[PDB]
Design a protein around this motif. Structure first.
Motif, short mmCIF file in Angstrom:
data_model
loop_
_atom_site.label_atom_id
_atom_site.label_comp_id
_atom_site.label_asym_id
_atom_site.label_seq_id
_atom_site.Cartn_x
_atom_site.Cartn_y
_atom_site.Cartn_z
N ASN A 189 0.65 -1.13 -0.03
CA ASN A 189 0.14 0.04 -0.08
C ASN A 189 0.92 1.32 -0.03
OD1 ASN A 189 -2.45 1.22 0.18
ND2 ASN A 189 -2.41 1.65 2.62
N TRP A 195 2.18 -4.84 2.46
CA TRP A 195 1.23 -5.70 2.60
C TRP A 195 1.43 -7.11 1.47
CZ3 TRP A 195 -1.96 -6.74 5.99
CH2 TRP A 195 -2.46 -5.85 6.96
N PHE A 216 -3.10 9.04 1.63
CA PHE A 216 -2.11 8.05 1.27
C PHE A 216 -0.99 8.10 0.22
CE2 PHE A 216 -1.60 4.54 4.41
CZ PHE A 216 -0.49 4.01 4.01
N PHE A 246 -6.49 -1.28 3.91
CA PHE A 246 -5.15 -1.61 4.31
C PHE A 246 -4.75 -1.07 5.64
CE2 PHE A 246 -3.47 -3.22 0.20
CZ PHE A 246 -3.54 -4.45 0.43
N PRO A 247 -4.67 0.24 5.96
CA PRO A 247 -4.13 0.76 7.30
C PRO A 247 -5.12 0.06 8.38
CG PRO A 247 -4.64 2.48 6.10
CD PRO A 247 -4.58 1.28 5.09
N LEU A 304 -3.78 -3.38 9.48
CA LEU A 304 -2.38 -3.42 10.12
C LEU A 304 -2.20 -4.00 11.35
CD1 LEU A 304 -0.81 -0.12 8.98
CD2 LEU A 304 0.00 -2.22 8.36
CL LIG Z 1 -1.16 0.22 5.01
#
Ligand SMILES: [Cl-]
Length: 293
Positions: free
Chosen positions: A39, A105, A166, A203-204, A207
């Motif tokens: 990512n 990722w 991002f 994605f974050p 984590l």
């Molecule tokens: Cl991420």
């Protein structure tokens, strides 16, 4: 200077009813080297590393579902969605044994696939990879409040979805040297429409930080337990100060993980490929020549 172009012929394969784009260069036989981005990148992140490996080995670099030139189905883009699509991508290409080169990722995907299919993995090169972050104190202080804010449906979606932070901010704060406008336009291209930014926000939120989400923490702990014992050949790249892997974490991993060689790339944050691609590529090619592949 560091290359900005993406000269690779486009390849597409149908995977679970969706089209995935991938780079595929180098010789047709031999053991292929599968490069997995994270990512908010794509196969573009490998563009200056692959040319060091392609003379001697097949290089396959897919764009994750919802990213790069791959299709954009209406998914939540959970890690589990990426697992399903990457598992099916590997089978759709008929890959048998592979060497993995993985980041962020892409490393969670690669390590998770390797732990489940260890007979098919002949080596892993990895960098700035996903490990459990036990508390927020082990997340870099300069990025701590923002990653905490990313992990909300209100403030975090405003930042990542509405304002593309991002790509416009976090990405740059993950590279030491300045990215050029041409490079930024390559990274921006898949995400011009805000609705397409779902993977960048999910994605974050996946984590494994401070025990959450518990399911990802468990899965990542499992593959790290495997990595600490498996004889699989390992090549670890690290930089200073790093983001996911601080230099102290890296030096200890190098001696703790079996059959592992560590390479210092110099200054680096998260996208080590953008700070020292030539060393990463040349060292992967050298290391490959030592493997029984
Ligand atoms: Cl991420």
């Amino acid at each position: 200077g560091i290359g900005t172009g993406f000269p690779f012929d486009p390849h597409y394969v149908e995977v679970l009813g969706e089209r995935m784009h991938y780079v595929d260069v180098g010789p047709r036989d031999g053991t292929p080297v599968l490069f997995l981005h994270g990512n908010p990148t794509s196969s573009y992140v490998w563009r200056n590393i692959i040319p060091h490996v392609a003379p001697t080995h097949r290089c396959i670099a897919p764009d994750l579902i919802g990213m790069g030139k791959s299709d954009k189905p209406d998914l939540g883009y959970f890690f589990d969605d990426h697992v399903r699509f990457m598992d099916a991508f590997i089978e759709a290409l008929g890959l048998e044994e592979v060497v993995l080169v993985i980041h962020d990722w892409g490393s969670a995907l690669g390590f998770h696939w390797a732990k489940r299919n260890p007979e098919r993995v002949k080596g892993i090169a990895f960098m700035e990879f996903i490990r459990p972050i036990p508390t927020w104190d082990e997340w870099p202080e300069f990025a701590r409040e923002t990653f905490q804010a990313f992990r909300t449906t209100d403030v975090g979606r405003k930042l990542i979805i509405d304002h593309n932070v991002f790509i416009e901010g976090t990405l740059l704060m993950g590279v030491v040297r300045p990215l050029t406008e041409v490079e930024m336009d390559h990274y921006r291209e898949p995400f011009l429409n805000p609705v397409d930014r779902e993977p960048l926000w999910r994605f974050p939120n996946e984590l494994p930080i401070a025990g959450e989400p518990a399911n990802i923490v468990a899965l990542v702990e499992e593959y790290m337990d495997w990595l600490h014992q498996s004889p699989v050949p390992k090549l670890l790249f690290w930089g200073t100060p790093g983001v996911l892997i601080p230099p102290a974490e890296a030096a200890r991993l190098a001696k703790s993980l079996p059959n592992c060689k560590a390479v210092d790339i110099g200054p680096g944050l998260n996208l080590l490929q953008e700070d020292n691609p030539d060393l990463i590529g040349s060292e992967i090619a050298r290391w490959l020549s030592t493997l029984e592949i």
